[PDB]
Amino acid sequence: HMTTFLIKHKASGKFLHPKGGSSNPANDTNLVLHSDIHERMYFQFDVVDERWGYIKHAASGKIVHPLGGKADPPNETKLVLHQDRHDRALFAMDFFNDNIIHKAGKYIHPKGGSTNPPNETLTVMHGDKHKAMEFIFVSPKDKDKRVLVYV
Amino acid sequence: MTTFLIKHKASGKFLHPKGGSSNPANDTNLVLHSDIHERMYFQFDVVDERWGYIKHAASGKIVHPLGGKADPPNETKLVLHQDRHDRALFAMDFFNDNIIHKAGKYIHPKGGSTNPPNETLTVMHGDKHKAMEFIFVSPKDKDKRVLVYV
Ligand SMILES: OC[C@H]1O[C@H](O)[C@H](O)[C@@H](O)[C@H]1O
Ligand SMILES: OC[C@H]1O[C@H](O)[C@H](O)[C@@H](O)[C@H]1O
Ligand SMILES: OC[C@H]1O[C@H](O)[C@H](O)[C@@H](O)[C@H]1O
Ligand SMILES: OC[C@H]1O[C@H](O)[C@H](O)[C@@H](O)[C@H]1O
Ligand SMILES: OC[C@H]1O[C@H](O)[C@H](O)[C@@H](O)[C@H]1O
Ligand SMILES: OC[C@H]1O[C@H](O)[C@H](O)[C@@H](O)[C@H]1O
Ligand SMILES: [Mg+2]
């Protein structure tokens, strides 16, 4: 069993989407911020090892990858969806500090770091911590109710 | 139903029911002790998102602030008790490595030592520091962290 949830950008109220909102995004489709809510921006978290797991797009089964699948992606590495499952797509959903951390230690950011980015803004990896990289994980039926993604 | 050990990060001691009984009486103190055995295994029963009950596996008793108050003061002793209610809600913060009560204070060793001796009591205190950090590990591998939210 896996709780279905929305990944909500705390500062803007926007959500993580595959660019274009497809039920089956092509491999390497970018992960962007968008204000819309619908079935094709639902996500699930597939726990792999304690805190580490795959951030899975619910509609397609593709998971979030740093583009290129490198072990230690540099700052500004774009985030995309890809079907492959391996250790470089491992993230942890820190619901206490409200962020999404990659196994190599960087966080998911809006590209450019705005607290209030436009729709379709890309998301990237970056080592910095500030309030524009905060995310909470909420019920698809109530965007203000936090849900436990680890069950 | 994952079973885990609650390991005091700085010393490597573990939370025990005082006395090591598989059947601790109500209001038995939670203490730190170096020994490992099934009578110090814990479970976590999720109630509401991050909040749940910290449960002594062998007895089913859960962790309470002594007195069951909703907003216990600093130095309130932590004990085991069978009752289930909202004043016994905790979250297991495995990212910052601490155990936080619903009202915002944390589980500490009494006195705040990074190396508390065996039988040191545990208490609630609002401060954050190295000596109140806990990690949650596998009974078959005291260095492998396990997910308690299950
Ligand atoms: O790029 C993301 C964006 O794509 C499409 O335009 C959809 O219609 C939107 O709802 C959103 O999912
Ligand atoms: O872009 C991400 C994607 O592409 C890489 O080159 C890898 O081969 C895949 O496993 C996946 O990580
Ligand atoms: O692209 C993401 C990046 O954008 C800006 O440069 C910010 O200052 C960084 O902290 C980070 O958020
Ligand atoms: O108080 C804790 C302590 O209690 C008893 O002495 C047990 O033998 C120990 O292993 C430990 O559980
Ligand atoms: O020691 C804790 C204990 O405190 C009170 O007496 C309550 O009535 C119990 O439910 C329990 O919480
Ligand atoms: O007993 C608990 C308490 O002990 C000391 O006062 C420490 O300074 C506090 O930070 C706390 O750990
Ligand atoms: Mg119960």
Q: Is residue A151 part of a domain?
A: no
Q: Is residue B58 part of a domain?
A: yes
How far apart CA A134 and CA B146 sit, in angstroms, is 25
What's the token pair of residue A60?
């397609």
What distance in angstroms lies between residue A85's CA and the mean position of ligand 2's atoms? 9
Q: Is residue B56 part of a domain?
A: yes
Q: Is residue B24 part of a domain?
A: yes
How far apart CA B90 and CA B101 sit, in angstroms, is 4
Length of chain A: 151
How far apart CA A12 and CA A138 sit, in angstroms, is 14
Residue of B65, B38, B53, B32 whose CA lies nearest to B134 = B32
Residue of B71, B82, B84, B76 whose CA lies nearest to B27 = B82
Instruction: Name all residues whose Cβ lies below 6 A of ligand 1.
Output: A 17, 19-21, 32, 34, 36, 38, 41, 120
> Under 8 Å CB-to-CB from B71, ≥6 apart: which residues?
B103
| Experimental method, per PDB record | X-ray
Angle at B74 between CA B71 and CA B77, to 5 degrees: 90
- The alpha carbon dihedral of A76, A82, A85, A90 has a sign of positive
CB of B95 less than 8 A from some CB of A: yes
CB of B150 less than 8 A from some CB of A: yes
What distance in angstroms lies between residue A77's CA and the mean position of ligand 5's atoms? 52
Q: Is residue A134 part of a domain?
A: yes
What resolution, expressed in A, was reported for this entry? Answer: 2.2
Hey, are the CB atoms on A51 and B146 less than 8 Å from each other? Answer: no
What distance in angstroms lies between residue A22's CA and the mean position of ligand 6's atoms? 53
Q: Which whole-number Å values give the CA distances from A58 to A5, A18, A24, A100, B75, in the listed order?
A: 9, 11, 10, 17, 46
Residue of A91, A80, A113 whose CA lies nearest to A12 = A113
Q: In chain B, which residues have their Cβ closer than 8 Å to the Cβ of A146?
A: 49-50
CB of B51 less than 8 A from some CB of A: no
- Angular region, A30: left φ>0, alpha ψ -120 to 50, beta rest: beta
What distance in angstroms lies between residue A64's CA and the mean position of ligand 2's atoms? 10
Q: Is residue B150 part of a domain?
A: no
β-strand pairing of A4-9 with A135-139? antiparallel
Q: In chain B, which residues have their Cβ closer than 8 Å to the Cβ of A92?
A: 95
Q: What residues make up the domain containing B107?
A: 5-145
CB of B147 less than 8 A from some CB of A: yes
CATH number of residue B111's parent domain = 2.80.10.50
Q: Is residue B52 part of a domain?
A: yes
Pick the residue whose CA is nearest to atom 6 on ligand 5.
B67
Pick the residue whose CA is nearest to atom 12 on ligand 6.
B112
Question: In testing the pocket of ligand 5, which one of B26, B82, B83 has its CB within 8 Å of the most ligand atoms?
Answer: B83
Q: Is residue A139 part of a domain?
A: yes
What's the token pair of residue A147?
């849900």
The number of folded domains in chain A is 1
